[PDB]
Design a protein around this motif. Structure first.
Motif, PDB file in Angstrom:
ATOM      1  N   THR A   1      -6.722   2.679  -3.777  1.00 42.80           N
ATOM      2  CA  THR A   1      -5.647   3.665  -3.861  1.00 42.80           C
ATOM      3  C   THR A   1      -5.794   4.782  -2.833  1.00 42.80           C
ATOM      4  O   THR A   1      -4.844   5.525  -2.589  1.00 42.80           O
TER       5      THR A   1
ATOM      6  N   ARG B   1      -3.364  -9.501  -2.047  1.00 43.48           N
ATOM      7  CA  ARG B   1      -2.199  -9.156  -2.881  1.00 43.48           C
ATOM      8  C   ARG B   1      -0.884  -9.718  -2.361  1.00 43.48           C
ATOM      9  O   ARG B   1       0.142  -9.625  -3.042  1.00 43.48           O
TER      10      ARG B   1
ATOM     11  N   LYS C   1      -4.883  -1.972   7.841  1.00 36.25           N
ATOM     12  CA  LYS C   1      -3.672  -2.233   7.096  1.00 36.25           C
ATOM     13  C   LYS C   1      -3.985  -3.060   5.844  1.00 36.25           C
ATOM     14  O   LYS C   1      -3.377  -2.859   4.783  1.00 36.25           O
ATOM     15  N   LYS C   2      -4.948  -3.974   5.978  1.00 37.62           N
ATOM     16  CA  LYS C   2      -5.376  -4.805   4.861  1.00 37.62           C
ATOM     17  C   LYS C   2      -6.209  -3.988   3.875  1.00 37.62           C
ATOM     18  O   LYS C   2      -6.057  -4.130   2.660  1.00 37.62           O
TER      19      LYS C   2
ATOM     20  N   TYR D   1      -4.120 -11.326   3.246  1.00 36.60           N
ATOM     21  CA  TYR D   1      -3.985 -10.255   2.232  1.00 36.60           C
ATOM     22  C   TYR D   1      -4.102 -10.809   0.818  1.00 36.60           C
ATOM     23  O   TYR D   1      -3.275 -11.631   0.419  1.00 36.60           O
TER      24      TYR D   1
ATOM     25  N   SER E   1       0.785  -1.240   0.000  1.00 38.11           N
ATOM     26  CA  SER E   1       0.000   0.000   0.000  1.00 38.11           C
ATOM     27  C   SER E   1       0.819   1.294   0.000  1.00 38.11           C
ATOM     28  O   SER E   1       0.286   2.353   0.315  1.00 38.11           O
TER      29      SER E   1
ATOM     30  N   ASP F   1      -9.591  -8.485  11.138  1.00 40.69           N
ATOM     31  CA  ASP F   1     -10.728  -8.286  10.226  1.00 40.69           C
ATOM     32  C   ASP F   1     -12.040  -8.545  10.950  1.00 40.69           C
ATOM     33  O   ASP F   1     -12.111  -9.417  11.830  1.00 40.69           O
TER      34      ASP F   1
ATOM     35  N   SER G   1      -9.288  -5.064   8.596  1.00 39.02           N
ATOM     36  CA  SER G   1      -8.134  -4.485   9.256  1.00 39.02           C
ATOM     37  C   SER G   1      -7.692  -3.278   8.407  1.00 39.02           C
ATOM     38  O   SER G   1      -7.689  -3.356   7.184  1.00 39.02           O
TER      39      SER G   1
ATOM     40  N   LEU H   1      -6.153  -0.886   2.903  1.00 36.46           N
ATOM     41  CA  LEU H   1      -5.372  -0.064   1.974  1.00 36.46           C
ATOM     42  C   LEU H   1      -4.960  -0.795   0.699  1.00 36.46           C
ATOM     43  O   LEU H   1      -4.993  -0.213  -0.399  1.00 36.46           O
ATOM     44  N   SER H   2      -4.563  -2.057   0.855  1.00 35.17           N
ATOM     45  CA  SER H   2      -3.972  -2.811  -0.240  1.00 35.17           C
ATOM     46  C   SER H   2      -4.933  -3.755  -0.956  1.00 35.17           C
ATOM     47  O   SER H   2      -4.483  -4.587  -1.759  1.00 35.17           O
ATOM     48  N   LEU H   3      -6.237  -3.631  -0.680  1.00 35.21           N
ATOM     49  CA  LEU H   3      -7.240  -4.391  -1.424  1.00 35.21           C
ATOM     50  C   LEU H   3      -7.123  -4.138  -2.942  1.00 35.21           C
ATOM     51  O   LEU H   3      -6.858  -3.010  -3.367  1.00 35.21           O
TER      52      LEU H   3
END
Ligand code: NA
Ligand code: NA
Ligand code: NA
Ligand code: NA
Lengths: 211, 211
Positions: free
Chosen positions: B138, A169, B129-130, A167, A133, B117, B127, B132-134
């Motif tokens: 962005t 990704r 932190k998770k 995750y 991220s 989660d 979560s 953000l990177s789905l």
């Protein structure tokens, strides 16, 4: 690139393969001294192009790799693009020069930790959860190398798998590595023993680091 | 929207402000029953537009909000866009319908946890932190509400701040909340005591959940 039979076996038994160019210049200072040098582009290109020409029909090969530990040079970028034109069917990865350069479709760090950052200058190893991220980052992350299995090791392995599963990704990685590179020597009684670096009068050597 | 002086004071003392339309339909079933209904678009629009017309000159207001716990309906989409056209100078946020809908510039969940989660159907709280990177995400993440400070609380507060500081796109959040909503009553001696839900013959009521 491996023995030809390896790909046949992986095709038939069922294993995803990352096929990697025979290019490593780890000992150069800095690591990209040759790979950023246009005079080394020809020797480098043959190592990439002749690999692709040989192995591109194997279903097991799912990812092309530009090599190992040769920093990031402009030759990498050229050869990245060469594969992308010639074979759009497979992603290209390459760890050198920070694992997220313009020469890789996949964020492919070696030994990035799950939660702990290692903010080395120029080539940091972010926590893999954090890496995903970073502002503007969109690519998948598969560790080209992780969980260094040297001797009594693989502590914290479960931490990686928990993260991989949570995750989307974070898509796994490749353990380092499969088999100890110990060689057989024989004592005076003709009995076999496992040898490592230095045991052949080889010096300088790096001792047990081959296992 | 607050008493007009509040903004003046935030301008002069220096606080960033999220100005929020007076819209909450929490008790509807489902939560967006009214906000997805075009007949209620006029009433909602006046709550959004008249706020912007009032407060758009205050430097302390840095983010517009479409309201609170009203699910996600088409009326939110239309009013999101209205603000974006009329005032480009400020991001627009709204948490309803799962905190990452098309009506928010900012992923703004309430009580999303750091590592854990909570996969509720339709409106999961990932979560942070998770989140953000789905795949494809962005946007920055700033919790509209976190660390519910009810009675003896704020256990795990440090965990948030560690993560806010580690992850660039975790840009903090807004604690819930500043001040207990207790009221003064008086015993037979005329001494004051702190009263909550139920203490005025109010029924049904939610007891101490106001503090
Ligand atoms: Na995964
Ligand atoms: Na080694
Ligand atoms: Na941050
Ligand atoms: Na409350």
């Amino acid at each position: 690139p491996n023995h030809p039979l390896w790909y046949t076996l992986c095709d038939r038994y069922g294993l995803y393969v990352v096929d990697e160019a025979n290019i490593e210049t780890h000992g150069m200072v800095p690591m990209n001294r040759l790979t950023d040098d246009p005079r080394w582009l020809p020797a480098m290109s043959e190592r990439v192009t002749r690999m692709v020409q040989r192995d591109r029909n194997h279903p097991s090969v799912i990812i092309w790799s530009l090599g190992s530990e040769s920093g990031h040079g402009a030759n990498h970028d050229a050869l990245y693009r060469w594969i992308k034109s010639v074979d759009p069917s497979r992603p290209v990865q390459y760890e050198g020069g920070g694992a997220d350069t313009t020469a890789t479709d996949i964020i492919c760090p070696m030994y990035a930790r799950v939660d702990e950052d290692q903010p080395f200058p120029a080539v940091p190893k972010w926590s893999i959860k954090k890496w995903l991220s970073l502002p503007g980052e969109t690519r998948p992350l598969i560790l080209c190398e992780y969980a260094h299995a040297m001797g009594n090791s693989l502590g914290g392995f479960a931490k990686y798998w928990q993260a991989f599963r949570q995750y989307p990704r974070l898509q796994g990685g490749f353990v380092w590595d499969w088999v100890d590179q110990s060689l057989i020597k024989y004592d005076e009684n003709g009995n076999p023993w496992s040898a490592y670096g230095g045991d052949f009068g080889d010096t300088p050597n790096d001792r047990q680091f081959c296992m």
